[PDB]
Ligand binder design. Structure first.
Ligand code: SF4
Ligand code: SF4
Lengths: 611, 611
């Protein structure tokens, strides 16, 4: 076997047992890695488990591209049954831990059980130990990684959780290298529930490559193509922050809990403003187009800015000064909580306060109040911090505020306001893990323009475009696993991927093979949700928030415009037709058989009727 | 088996293999623990090795008293073939590592081999790992322990080496809890030679004891006997520092490389001065008479003062301000170098400089110059610092200054100047590990008074006294292994010891059994020296420094007086007569047989003729 090790590191925190599981080359070829491998593991090992119980499996899954010098191939997938959504949950982050896990001889790391006290997992090739982290517990993510490196050396990959993870904030994430984050659906809370403070990894092994020279050649070509792309200069300057102006121009910038798609103060929180306050730039392993832009916040502290962070903690909160939004951003990284769900939870509180629903709490534009709430959420201080720490779905159940609860499947909607964007609304509605733009950022195509540089339509071809994008963004890139931005942003040819894959693994994958592996992952993931939800499931699970159907844009040429539910419903049926799912969004028996998921049928039938 | 576990933790840094060695209860009964067990291990496993080579064995040996709540029972022996003397070397320190090692299920820890890069050993009960210490290398002992606890928590025992150990200073030691030190004969250099930066230990097991109720009863009585002793109040005030005035009054205070036994500025570095500058008091585990007296030095830094540190870095260097001596003391602790050998080496340089033998270097009374040289020794910076880092024996050979090289067997003489004290000179001459007062502080008995509160003689009875004290101090207390101070200083009855040993192990030891066990250890150690010296050995190996014969006291009523060679030689023969050793200081065959050391005979016969 080349590329894949066929090895998965297993750590049981309850028993202290550490072992290496060998999985068949057939499974590796069939699921490829990252999310695929994770979905296979969770389907088999997390049936009916409580997300915060010792039985949940915390998975760190790499893929064949990882550990090797592949173009922006320093990504890693973190997965577990989600404490926020109750379904399959995952996330991705660039981190040296990805390079080291693979160079240490493993394709993935699976943590089960729960330690008796705070501990961290140490991995140096074949030497794996569960060590006491009593001294680290309570420290920020930044401080935890800094201290671990002060002991073991700079040459290690470190994954940590901060107080939000330790306190089981439902959208707590895993942090690496002060800025890289993974696991919006609460991977950080699953990590915290096991009393797992960090993971330190070092690898030195040579990963067996089927064609060393092709690999080295293809990689050099791709790097050069990136360096020579016309978008490279502007990408180097603004990175994802170029989307603030682009979204504002197109009425897609979430403003005041998604109330409007335009923000009057977007310029003072945009990419140009960011350029003027940038002090450093860093990136993920093996990437020659770094986009981790670091600024100084209002308190003079370094903060790494990404578009989503700014959109959800800036315009979405009615906060118009980038230096202030940057303080909130830093807090999220330090505490280890998702900037998106954090911002949407805060915005939800702000709307409830302005409406008189909540007697106390911050209002839109209130930076000091937003900062205090962010901190109270991470430390679960007071009734408000505790409520908001649960996310908008849970919070809305308690407050009767479902009308303005911006989420899909319990996962908070990200940085694109879709009052007039049917395809993007469908992307959020059908995202495998819950509302996220990860799997299909189709709004650009719907508009005809993109950040590096209108008539509302429900054409069934939009459902086809979303499935196509999900195959690449929610499948391929989450399985390799590698950054999708070189392709998305600078236009690196997708042809490099199946070639790099054969050069590495020696297996020839055609685009249809890849499209099929991605579809298998999608149906398996959906199957997981259906099974864990005990068959209680229908098409409404794939609907975007009610706000986009009952309210419209508040300003500009498109004022009053919104989504037509009837037409959205028809577009959803088209999505199901293309995926081979029934009108409830559940995979059909024939579809499962065709995707080599026969094993799913018996289990799903114990819970509902299949078609 | 009670008391002893009969288990030794084994760590091979070259191969990375960790295993547990079981040894018979008969060996445990025979050698008891600590130095006894260490001597057994070195005899069998450090045969013909280079002290700084991977084959040398670094031993951390505890005894049956350790890990249990025994009066001042938190001591630990650190042993290995010495890079300073070439013979058997060991030292002792109080440390929570002692409590933890034994509660983790081990009687001792033996480290062999050499790591490719800096590492530290982590022990938590049965979970043992070799971890990267690449970020730690180069840090002071204080900072190393502090950082390790910032990761693993406060409930651990830690042993570290500082830059002096890393740089292989010949008298580098192992440090714990910013003040406790062990291994004057270079144990820190052996540790540094293996690229072992630290040992972190945690133990939670219940150590099996034969009679828990009697152990509890005896310990409470002993603790109360200490509290209620007439010497307790003055001890709590001055600790070992009371010896500065006592030695000065009796012309035993090493002054200017032992040139005199009287120092004109002794009051300014004495116990009363120490009391006026004490800011804290620390101690070893399970001790109710803590003696780690912490003062602020001339630089406002904390420094724990012990008599020897002050005598050898103060009066011995012509430095009369305690705050300045405390700066040197702190450097010795931070760097991890023996204060005694450091001071004697610096003192040697000062005399050579003032005699014009050395053209560059500090002179007596030169604090600034002494500080710079101490730092240069730790970092092996320059010709002078590298030379002094070798110790006086090696340094004297190069400079041809043997006439004033104060050492015995290559270990520098400690804090008692013996121009007029034959028994104490015999104590230094016959000390099992080289010049040290550890095994027999007979000078107090020789004069008739003690710090806690004369006509020179060579009576044969003085050799008997030295043997008796060696049995207790170099044997019993190094085997239990427990602090000898409660007995020496406040008069704790020695009768508690055999009784406590019985309550713990279930085995009865009469005083004759203990004397025999101690004599067995003394002959096995002497046999190790002879064998490692390839048979090149004679009575002059047990001679005190030449200066005590060729010069006399420079002050007071005893001005001009010194030791007589012929008379000392007869006293030494009396010592051998009592020990059953021949006129070359080598154990006789019948003595070895009597002490159950038959196995030693064949090995000694390959290098010399036995009697
Ligand atoms: S483009 Fe940005 S997110 Fe992608 S690998 Fe490079 S630094 Fe990481
Ligand atoms: S008397 Fe001093 S050296 Fe002995 S155990 Fe107590 S604190 Fe340690």
């Amino acid at each position: 076997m080349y590329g894949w090790w066929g090895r998965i590191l297993r750590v049981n925190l309850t028993t202290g047992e550490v072992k290496v599981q060998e999985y068949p080359e057939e499974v590796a070829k069939k699921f490829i890695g990252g999310r695929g491998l994770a979905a296979w593991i969770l389907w088999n090992e997390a049936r009916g488990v409580e997300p915060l119980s010792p039985e949940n499996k915390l998975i760190f899954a790499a893929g064949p591209f990882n550990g090797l010098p592949t173009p922006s191939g320093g990504k890693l997938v973190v997965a577990a049954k989600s404490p926020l959504t109750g379904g399959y949950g995952d996330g991705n982050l660039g981190t040296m831990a990805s390079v080291h896990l693979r160079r240490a001889g493993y394709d993935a790391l699976v943590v089960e059980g729960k330690a008796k006290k705070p501990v961290y997992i140490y991995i140096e090739d074949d030497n794996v130990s569960i060590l006491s982290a009593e001294g680290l517990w309570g420290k920020t993510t930044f401080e935890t990684e800094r201290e671990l490196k002060e002991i073991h050396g700079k040459n290690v990959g470190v994954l940590t959780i901060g107080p939000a993870g330790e306190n089981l904030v439902k959208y707590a994430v895993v942090i690496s290298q002060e800025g890289r984050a993974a696991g919006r659906p609460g991977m950080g809370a699953v990590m915290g529930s096991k009393k797992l403070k960090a993971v330190v990894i070092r690898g030195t092994k040579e990963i067996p490559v089927a064609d060393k020279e092709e690999l080295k050649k293809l990689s050099q070509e791709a790097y050069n193509e990136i360096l020579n792309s016309p978008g490279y200069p502007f990408w180097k300057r603004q990175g994802t922050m170029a989307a603030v102006e682009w979204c504002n121009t197109n009425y897609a910038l979430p403003t005041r809990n998604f109330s409007d798609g335009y923000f009057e103060f977007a310029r003072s929180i945009d990419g140009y403003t960011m350029e003027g306050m940038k002090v450093q730039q860093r990136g993920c392993p093996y990437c020659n187009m770094p986009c981790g832009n670091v600024v100084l916040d209002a308190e003079g502290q370094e903060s790494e800015l990404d578009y989503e962070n700014v959109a959800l903690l800036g315009s979405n909160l009615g906060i118009g000064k980038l230096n202030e939004v940057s303080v909130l951003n830093r807090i999220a990284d330090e505490m280890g909580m998702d900037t998106i769900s954090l911002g949407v939870s805060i915005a939800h509180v702000m709307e409830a306060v302005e409406r008189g629903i909540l007697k106390e709490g911050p209002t839109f534009g209130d930076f000091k109040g937003a900062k205090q709430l962010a901190l109270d959420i991470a430390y679960r201080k007071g009734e408000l911090g505790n409520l908001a720490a649960e996310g908008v779905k849970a919070m809305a159940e308690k407050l009767g505020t479902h009308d303005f609860a911006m989420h899909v499947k319990g996962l908070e909607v990200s940085g694109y306001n879709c009052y007039i964007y049917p395809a993007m609304a469908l992307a959020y509605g059908t995202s495998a893990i819950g509302a996220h733009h990860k799997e299909a950022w189709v709004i650009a195509w719907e508009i005809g323009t993109a950040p590096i540089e209108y008539k509302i339509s429900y054409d069934p071809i939009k459902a086809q475009k979303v499935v196509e994008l999900q195959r690449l963004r929610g499948g391929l890139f989450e399985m390799l696993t590698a950054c999708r931005l070189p392709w998305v942003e600078v236009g690196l040819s997708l042809d490099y991927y199946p070639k790099l894959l054969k050069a590495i693994t020696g297996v020839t994958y055609t685009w249809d093979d890849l499209y099929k592996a991605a579809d298998r992952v999608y149906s398996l993931i959906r199957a997981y949700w259906v099974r864990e939800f005990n068959g209680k499931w229908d098409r409404k699970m794939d609907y975007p928030p009610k706000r986009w159907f009952t309210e419209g844009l508040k300003s500009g040429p498109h004022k009053g415009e919104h989504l037509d539910e009837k037409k959205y419903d028809e577009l959803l049926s088209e999505y199901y037709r293309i995926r081979g799912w029934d009108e409830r969004g559940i995979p059909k028996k024939e579809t499962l058989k065709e995707l080599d998921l026969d094993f799913v049928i018996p289990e799903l039938e114990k819970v509902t009727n299949l078609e």
